[PDB]
Design goal:
Keywords (chain A): ATP-binding, Coenzyme A biosynthesis, Cytoplasm, Kinase, Nucleotide-binding, Transferase
EC number (chain A): 2.7.1.33
Order of helices and strands of chain A: EHHHEHEHHEEEEEEHHEE
CATH class of chain A: Alpha Beta
Largest sheet of chain A: 7 strands, mixed
Number of domains of chain A: 1
Helix content of chain A: 25-40%
Largest interface: A-B, 54 and 54 residues
Protein name (chain A): Pantothenate kinase
Distance between the termini of chain A: 14 Å
Structural class of chain A: alpha/beta
Oligomer: homodimer
Number of strands of chain A: 11
CATH topology of chain A: Rossmann fold
Subcellular location (chain A): Cytoplasm
Strand content of chain A: 15-25%
Enzyme class (chain A): transferase
Strand order of the largest sheet of chain A: 1-11-10-9-2-8-3
Radius of gyration of chain A: 20 Å
CATH superfamily of chain A: P-loop containing nucleotide triphosphate hydrolases
CATH architecture of chain A: 3-Layer(aba) Sandwich
Number of helices of chain A: 8
Chain lengths: 306, 288
Amino acid sequence: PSPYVEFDRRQWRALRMSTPLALTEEELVGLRGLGEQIDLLEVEEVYLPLARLIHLQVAARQRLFAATAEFLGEPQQNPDRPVPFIIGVAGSVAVGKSTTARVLQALLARWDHHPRVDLVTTDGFLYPNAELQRRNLMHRKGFPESYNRRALMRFVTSVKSGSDYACAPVYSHLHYDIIPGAEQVVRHPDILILEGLNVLQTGPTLMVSDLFDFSLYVDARIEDIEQWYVSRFLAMRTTAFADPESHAHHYAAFSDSQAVVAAREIWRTINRPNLVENILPTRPRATLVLRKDADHSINRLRLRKL
Amino acid sequence: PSPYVEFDRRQWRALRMSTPLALTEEELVGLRGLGEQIDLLEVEEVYLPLARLIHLQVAARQRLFAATAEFLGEPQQNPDRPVPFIIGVAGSVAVGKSTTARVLQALLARWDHHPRVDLVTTDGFLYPNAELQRRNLMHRKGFPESYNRRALMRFVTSVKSGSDYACAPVYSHLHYDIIPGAEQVVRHPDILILEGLNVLQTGPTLMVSDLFDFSLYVDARIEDIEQWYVSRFLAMRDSQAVVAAREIWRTINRPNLVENILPTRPRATLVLRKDADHSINRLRLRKL
C-alpha cells in the first residue's frame, strides 16, 4: 500500500458523492467572482466534496477540543475556544494555488461551525524588493531565504496559540512588491488558510507546517506549469505591468516573442529551480495532493489515509 | 500567548477530572511489577489521565475515518480500517522514554476501541556496530546519521499505509548491538508507539514525525539526566564504572542531547518534565 487513497477523475465521478449543503445555480455563478480561472464543474464535482471532507476534519477537531476541555474540568489554563484550524496550500508559482485557496475559503465559510475563514498568502512575508536588493537575494525571490521566516513563524504561532490579534504584512500582486505600512489583521478565525511557495518547507526546529491541521499541494507536470507561467506573464503586459508604479512595468512593452523569452528565462533561472529544489520535495508532506492536467482540470486526487 | 496549556504537578493534581480514573488491580493489567522504574502514585496521578486524553484523540480519529469513509461511499481504494494511530516518544538517553512508552502502551490497550497497542524502539534502526565502524560513527552512536533513516522511514510508512505486516530489526542492550537476524513484526495495531532518540528530528522532505498522530517529549534538567544515566550504567554492570559512564555521557550522549534531541522538544504535542526524583512536575499540552 501507499499512505494515500488515490482517485483519478473517472473514479472520483464514479463515487457519486452527495452534496448535503448544496449550492444553487446563482450561488455557483457567484463563484465566478473569485478569479478568472473558475470552472463550475471543477467547483461542483471536486471542490464541494473536498470542502465537505475538510469540514469533517475541522468539526472533529472542534469536538475533540470540547471533549478534552470537559475531561480536564475546564481549568482556567485551558482556552475557552478551539484554536483556529490552519490549512496550508502549497505548489509551484502559477499552478493555481491562489484560485484553489479562494474556492476553499468561499466553500468552508458556508458551515455555521466555522463561518470565519481567513486567507493569508505568505507572499506578504517576502522581504520588499529594496530589502531583497540590500540582502543580495533579488535573483532568489520566492526561495525560502527571500522571506522573513521569523516574522512568518511569529504570525502563524500567534494564530495557532489562539490570539485575538495577529498581523501580517501585505504584498501588492499588481506592483510585485510589499505595500509599505499595509497590514492584514487576523482575529482568531475559525479556519486560517495559509497559501504560498514555502508553506510545507522543512526547517531544523519548529517549521510553520508544524502548526497546520491540514495541507493541500496543487500539482501538475512541470512543463504544463511552465506554459501557464508564460501565459500569465504575457497577459500581465496590458494589465498588471501597465501601471508605471509596478516593479514589473519595464516588461509592459515587450513584443509577444520578447515576452516569451523573458518569461521562459525567469522560469529557467528562478521559478523552476525553486520548484525542483524547494517546493516539489514538500509534495509528499501534504494531506491532500491535487494534480491538474494541461487544461487545468483535476485528474488525480491523493488523500492521506485516515 | 503560549501555544500550550501548562500545568505544574499541584495544578494537575487539583484538576477535577470527568472520569473516576480508578487505580484497581484490573486497571494495571500489563503493568504488574513496576520496577524501581515508576511509582504507582505516578501511574495514578499522571499516566491514567494522560492515557484517557490520548484515548480521546484516538477515538476521534477512528470516528473521522468512519465519517470520511461513509462520505466517500466506501470505495475499493479506501481502506476498511483506520490506519494505526502513531505516537512518538522522544527525549535524552536515560530520561525515562522507555518506561513512559511501556506505561502508555499497557494503559491504552485497556480500551475496547483500541486493544492492540505495539511499541517499537528506533534503537532497532541503528546501524550495526560493524557498519558504524566503517562509517566512523561509534562515538556518535544515537546521533541522527547513526540510524538507517531510509529503513526507519520505510517501516513507519508501511505501518501508516495500513500494511498487515511491517518488520523492524531489534537492538540488544545486553549485547550492545543490533541482534543479527532478529525482527519484530508489527501487524496493523490500533496504536503504534514509536520511542527513540530521533523520533522528532527533522529532514528535508517527508520525515518520520509526518506520520505521527501524537507525540511526547520526556524532559528533565540535563544535570539530573546525567545522574540517572550514571546510576543506570552502574546498575547495568565501580568508581571505575562511574568514570566510564561519565566519559560516555560527556563524549556522546550529552552532545547528542544538546545538538539533536533538545531542539525537537517544541515539536511534541505534549512535553512532560521530570524533577530530580523522577516525578513529573510540569505538563505542557498543545492547545486543541
